[PDB]
Design an enzyme around this catalytic site. Structure first.
Site, PDB file in Angstrom:
ATOM      1  N   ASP A  13      -6.873   4.292  -5.297  1.00 23.55           N
ATOM      2  CA  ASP A  13      -7.537   4.133  -3.969  1.00 23.55           C
ATOM      3  C   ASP A  13      -8.192   5.475  -3.642  1.00 23.55           C
ATOM      4  O   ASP A  13      -8.321   6.298  -4.530  1.00 23.55           O
ATOM      5  CB  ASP A  13      -6.520   3.834  -2.854  1.00 23.55           C
ATOM      6  CG  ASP A  13      -7.147   3.004  -1.730  1.00 23.55           C
ATOM      7  OD1 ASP A  13      -7.430   1.797  -1.962  1.00 23.55           O
ATOM      8  OD2 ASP A  13      -7.264   3.533  -0.608  1.00 23.55           O
ATOM      9  N   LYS A  18       0.883  -1.196   0.000  1.00 22.68           N
ATOM     10  CA  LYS A  18       0.000   0.000   0.000  1.00 22.68           C
ATOM     11  C   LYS A  18       0.886   1.200   0.000  1.00 22.68           C
ATOM     12  O   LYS A  18       1.994   1.184   0.515  1.00 22.68           O
ATOM     13  CB  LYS A  18      -0.906   0.105   1.243  1.00 22.68           C
ATOM     14  CG  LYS A  18      -2.094   1.017   0.989  1.00 22.68           C
ATOM     15  CD  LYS A  18      -3.122   0.218   0.187  1.00 22.68           C
ATOM     16  CE  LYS A  18      -4.370   1.052  -0.189  1.00 22.68           C
ATOM     17  NZ  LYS A  18      -5.359   0.063  -0.781  1.00 22.68           N
TER      18      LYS A  18
HETATM   19  N1  LIG Z   1      -7.458   0.109  -4.174  1.00 24.74           N
HETATM   20  C1  LIG Z   1      -7.969  -1.193  -4.621  1.00 24.74           C
HETATM   21  C2  LIG Z   1      -7.289  -1.599  -5.931  1.00 24.74           C
HETATM   22  C3  LIG Z   1      -5.807  -2.010  -5.732  1.00 24.74           C
HETATM   23  C4  LIG Z   1      -5.185  -2.686  -6.930  1.00 24.74           C
HETATM   24  O1  LIG Z   1      -5.950  -2.811  -7.940  1.00 24.74           O
HETATM   25  O2  LIG Z   1      -3.939  -3.009  -6.857  1.00 24.74           O
HETATM   26  C5  LIG Z   1      -7.741  -2.159  -3.428  1.00 24.74           C
HETATM   27  O3  LIG Z   1      -7.743  -1.814  -2.303  1.00 24.74           O
HETATM   28  O4  LIG Z   1      -7.718  -3.352  -3.740  1.00 24.74           O
END
Ligand SMILES: N[C@@H](CCC(=O)O)C(=O)O
Ligand SMILES: N[C@@H](CCC(=O)O)C(=O)O
Ligand SMILES: N[C@@H](CCC(=O)O)C(=O)O
Ligand SMILES: N[C@@H](CCC(=O)O)C(=O)O
EC number: 1.4.1.2
Lengths: 449, 449, 449, 449
Positions: free
Chosen positions: C165, C125
């Site tokens: 996100d 993240k």
């Molecule tokens: N933000 C989304 C997408 C993340 C992604 O596609 O790598 C999540 O929490 O899964």
């Protein structure tokens, strides 16, 4: 030392097919017994067992095309033996006899020699079974390009710095370097040493090996409350090393009285001590005729064909040409002549039988080549410094450091031999001084290599 | 072909000390005469002379520490033999007999085997003289880490993809891969094949070699207007390959009737054809007891100690265990028994004397291991595809391609032998099909490698 | 499990200052007791202790200049938590509350979520405390460039693939990607996911999270011998996820009857089931007005300001907006209403107190967000596959795989919970299925990470 | 559009010395007025001004040695014009007329052509003023090696993928690729397309350009409620493209009735529609005689020396040979003949004067080469996909996608022209469809490039 004996036995068995390597290991390791017995910690981290196996060996295919369009294939080697105290460092040898055994033996010895210089240089050796004899300049160029097209990815100014040896001179270094700078897209001229001045070579390069060997002999005289002045010297060859030594001997009050060729040898009681005489060697070298007679024809001095000059009565013997030049046969003549100073200049110019023998003689001083010829690699180290500083030093700066270091290599060796109770044994002393720095570094670096 | 004979003679002389390599070259090159004589252009670019020298060989030191803190030193190899048609590819072998000769011979054969798969895979082999026998799991892990700490810089998903072999299984591949991903700082899991599923291994991996060998035999039956159904088969071993073959033979209507161990061999006239029987092999493998008797004790079937199962009268002989298993002695028994199908599954399970002999027999069908066991490396190729696509295929997808390719390897070989007028000679056919693709690629790529 | 309890206690003490992270670890680890107790080998290699510490954390300075020439400074993060089963993967969040605690908690959960997809994706993240609210398009662009000017060196298609996100959408992904391709000098468009179609984005991207959540609920109905058809659903938000869910619910025979905004919530007994109704959400989103009333004004449906829609009697509750949306207060209403299906869609939309409570209710089905919203990251995985294959899949291909995987995530979770005797506990099941693959991979990879 | 006119004027002034480039820009930009006027945002970020300047241009020295040892020097180019939607992509042209102007014009057009394929491919062009005419195979090999020794550092599978063009075929691609893989030390065969099958080339490669052009014409017939069946076609050349087109025309019910050579042209009222006739073209190509008469001598058909076949009355004109083939003079003949279908196949086979003219004719259908010949680059895209997947597709898979895409390129162009109110103007339509994807990507990527 039981530990030492054990490693030699395991080496002898495992690398049976590599006779040259086995012998060198035995010869060096056997002189280290006292040092190893004083350091039990070495055995615990299997130090000797690590040391005898190169860090990395690379062999590769080298196809190339001749002036007639015919395709030839040779094999390229680089043995990166030990890099504990500096980037790998060592010459390139192009000769049809080259194989892994010979690369490992020269590469193992190179580590010890480089350690003695007091500069940060590791030990390596490389080359090819390509034979430059009879090739055109253009053929040697294409070979050097194809050789470097693979080699470049294993070397670099901070990784592994090759240089010349048998079959590899300024000309080959130039061609390899051109290919390197083209592939890599930058300068990095510290990648090779032995370069021409125009692109970063050092002054005193040509004289280096020869002068260095005379500064060492000078430190020997001093040790022995003796003097170079007036001494006579038997050389072998008429090449670079011989040229450099003759030159500096003369300047120092001494004089060489022999040279040698595959055709025989000359004797020149007056001494190869004149600009005219000295310079002519360059000529003969140039000439590519490969005959020492030319000097005798030119200067009207004795020329004994098919004979070694090891029979002449002189103060100092300095074999500066080929391997296993001095054998038992020649050593016995030397002995009979009551020569006190036997100073190896060329690499392994003496067989072992010959070496032990000379070494048993109580009155004699025997200097090993790894120490005596360190002058050349020492100037290669100065060249890497100059290239890293991006400037040139003057000839006086280089020669003066050359001089001080060669003296120290001698003095250090003596002190070391004496410390372990070996007397004035320059041969074991060179091995011990070289080994100690490497050991210290490997012990400090842990068990990674 | 005079050209062929000449290259074999030069190889024999230059690599005298590498007997295993010399023999393999002779064996393969000698079958290519017809092809080479049809392509004079090969000789002009010294194609064969290039082919017999690996592109690149790397050897390196591997110090590592045991569970007791003692330091051991081994030597690591990777021979990157030929990369004309794909990244280098080939297994890792950890065994105390490993040396350069053995790496080059397996690596030369690997190039031909990989060429047959029809996938873009080059040929390589590597390993160490480290002996996993008796080491702890933790010891094998530290060894694998130290081995990879140097190896990583020579391999990569687009450069050289190693995999398992004798002494190297999923467990070792896992430990090496963990070290790799840590040093490199990324995923790149296509760097090794034979991985566990959790980090990118392919379904059908365990079954691959064994099933593949049965699909090939199936294509042989078809060729010969015959059928697997009802056939009996002598296997050797109780391992992975044997397990996979027995399994697929049974499914196909056939049945294996022997297994083998260092302790002897068993005979099971009913056939190792049940889930219970078949699965037990896994047990015995697991058990680490290393005895085939267990199966006989368990199932109450004959157990002849210290004997090969080559004497039993069966339809098909499939040696799937060790080298030079079948000798002249065993071949003569096979002959006497009037067995028509001799199918090498394990690597070099037959001596040459034995091979020529079997090959002189007019009524017999002899299949070479480089073709028959291609199933495993073929699934390693599918694994690299899956890793590059960043997804998994289903078992049905993998098995169905496995099947179609093995059939083609058989058919292609036959067609090739027949084309050069050799009859139904599957052994030369495999060599020819393999060589042709490689030659085409090298000729197109010019004189660089 | 004593081992589990011990790791939670050490975490609580060491990361006291990171409350969000501490709670997540406790929540996840506490559900794994049964699995860990069945695998003593985990404790021996300190598996859990390793798992709770990210492999690598990077924080960096981000100076940037606004439309007026004023210089602002923010801080950038990327926590590369676990890469055992694929390149690191996870979104970027730009919000003034962002700090290390919040990055680690979302990054730890991301590893478990990514493991469930069945694709090779690790967990990470990142983001910044930069606040996009009120910035111009040009300001957001310069920020994204300066953020990427440092970030690029830590990520890459085989290393770490970020995505959007909170605060980070297609627009920001576009600007970061432009900077990346410029600095790196190549395409590598698999470096980021959530891209626009013109440069490699996948079809079904916008619908992904929402549709995925409905396919999962569908698998829940099936489990429970029930049906979506006719069911009513309370949503929260009017955004992407809400839009996607409403859409697919309608198609499936169901209908959403609420939406929600910071201003209150609406009730639409008819169902947000028409093209006109459904599409309007996009409008309101567009509008940037941020009011759910607009829908009620437009469609003439109830609008209760300052109220959550958790009070309406419906078949299924799907919170798809913000964190800690559903509290004890709201859970009690839900309970009172005799709602059986509580399905978390947005991330952490429920407080723990609320969660345990809902979880104590015997008749209820509670689905955790890490499983339910996996659809989006699952399409990000398909996008990386398409980019690696250098082609596009059709919408039908993507939607059909999306569908099959979401079903499997549900079924797998159930089976796992049931296996460890937990009943139909979808919350622990998601944790267990996710943990197992990761554990298997880490155990196989040894002690490196 | 005033904006468009302004950029053309600035281009005309700044690149006065690059006539070919100036004209192409004017020709393309002038057709985009309607699109640009509908998107004011473009002007604000200076989109067109950015587009007309290549991202990166590289020129380099290329010394090389001939079979006689003489040293020659040429200049190498690679213009990496636009990489917004994929790695740079475009052919290599070796011809003594090559200079920067010509590279930029072909490279600007390549961006638009590549954008139409619907695959992720950017636009580039490169080559050298080296003249392959009269060089030996060995000379072409050394040139290709020296050219690649510098080029390799600017390209790569994810960066810039070159391919063949005038003067560069499979043979040159093979030699460059061999040098590349040697320098880089890995496979990476997706670095070049147009490769031979043995090292990753795609099936349908040779047929690609020709077949593609016929699938497009087919979509034209359909548009026009017409049919290929029965149609006659005038081709130019006897080469690859001509061979491929004739072949597919015949299969489709049509027939070509002319071919052309520097020596004149032939007329074959029966149609180059037989295996024997069709295959002979390959012969003549092979032959290296360069005369179209051979076909007439062989088949006993008319041979009009020193004449273009543009005078024959046929249904469809497809110029597939050289530039500025069709001039005003030839266009007027075409017109006079009442030919409705004029389909550019080769690159810029028509002068502008000729083009406007044909374009003013109300009853005519004029198809631009950037769309019609997209089949070849489209198969180069499929080859990169296959190489990335590390497998091969079947011929049926490749041909079937080829077919569907070419249809879409036609249909898409029409729809686009129609949308901006231009009628059925395939020429502007190709420009518009190509520009839109690129614009979308550049706008999304921000101001970096
Ligand atoms: N933000 C989304 C997408 C993340 C992604 O596609 O790598 C999540 O929490 O899964
Ligand atoms: N060949 C010389 C020079 C090597 C070097 O300068 O690196 C030697 O053996 O030392
Ligand atoms: N060791 C097996 C597998 C090698 C591989 O999968 O690369 C072989 O000899 O083919
Ligand atoms: N030279 C062809 C092929 C280029 C390619 O395949 O990249 C062209 O102009 O499109």
């Amino acid at each position: 030392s039981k530990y030492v004996d054990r490693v030699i036995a395991e080496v002898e068995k495992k690398y049976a097919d590599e006779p040259e390597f086995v012998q060198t290991v035995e010869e060096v390791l056997s002189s280290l017994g006292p040092v190893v017995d004083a350091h039990p910690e070495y055995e615990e981290v299997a130090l000797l067992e690590r040391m005898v196996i190169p860090e990395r060996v690379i062999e590769f295919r080298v196809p190339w095309e001749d002036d007639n369009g015919k395709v030839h294939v040779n094999t390229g080697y680089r043995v990166q033996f030990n890099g504990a105290i500096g980037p790998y460092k060592g010459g390139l040898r192009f000769a049809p006899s080259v194989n892994l055994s010979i690369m490992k033996f020269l590469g193992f010895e190179q580590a010890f020699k480089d350690s003695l210089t007091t500069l940060p240089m590791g030990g390596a050796k490389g080359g090819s079974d390509f034979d430059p004899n009879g090739k055109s300049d253009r053929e040697v160029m294409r070979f050097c390009q194809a050789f470097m097209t693979e080699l470049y990815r294993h070397i670099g100014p901070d990784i592994d710095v090759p240089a010349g040896d048998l079959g590899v001179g300024a000309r080959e270094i130039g061609y390899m370097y051109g290919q390197y700078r083209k592939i890599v897209g930058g300068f990095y001229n510290g990648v090779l040493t032995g370069k021409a001045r125009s692109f970063g070579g050092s002054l005193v390069r040509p004289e280096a090996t020869g002068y260095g060997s005379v500064y060492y002999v000078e430190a020997v005289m001093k040790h022995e409350n003796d003097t170079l002045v007036g001494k006579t010297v038997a050389l072998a060859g008429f090449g670079n090393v011989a040229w450099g030594a003759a030159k500096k001997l003369a300047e120092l009050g001494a004089k060489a009285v022999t040279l040698s060729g595959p055709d025989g040898y000359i004797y020149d009681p007056e001494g190869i001590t004149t600009e005219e005489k000295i310079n002519y060697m360059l000529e003969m070298r140039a000439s590519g005729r490969n005959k020492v007679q030319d000097y005798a024809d030119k200067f009207g001095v004795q020329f004994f064909p098919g004979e070694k000059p090891w029979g002449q009565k002189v103060d100092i013997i300095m074999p500066c040409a080929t391997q296993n030049d001095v054998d038992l046969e020649q050593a016995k003549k030397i002995v009979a002549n009551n020569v006190k100073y036997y100073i190896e200049v060329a690499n392994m110019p003496t067989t072992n039988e010959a070496l032990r023998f000379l070494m048993q003689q109580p009155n004699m001083v025997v200097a090993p080549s790894k120490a005596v010829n360190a002058g050349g690699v020492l100037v290669s180290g100065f060249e890497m410094s100059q290239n890293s500083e991006r400037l040139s030093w003057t000839a006086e700066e280089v020669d003066s450091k050359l001089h001080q270091v060669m003296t120290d290599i001698h003095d250090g060796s003596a002190a070391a031999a004496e410390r372990y109770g070996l007397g004035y044994n320059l041969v074991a002393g060179a091995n011990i001084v070289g080994f100690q720095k490497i050991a210290d570094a490997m012990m400090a670096q842990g068990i990674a290599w």
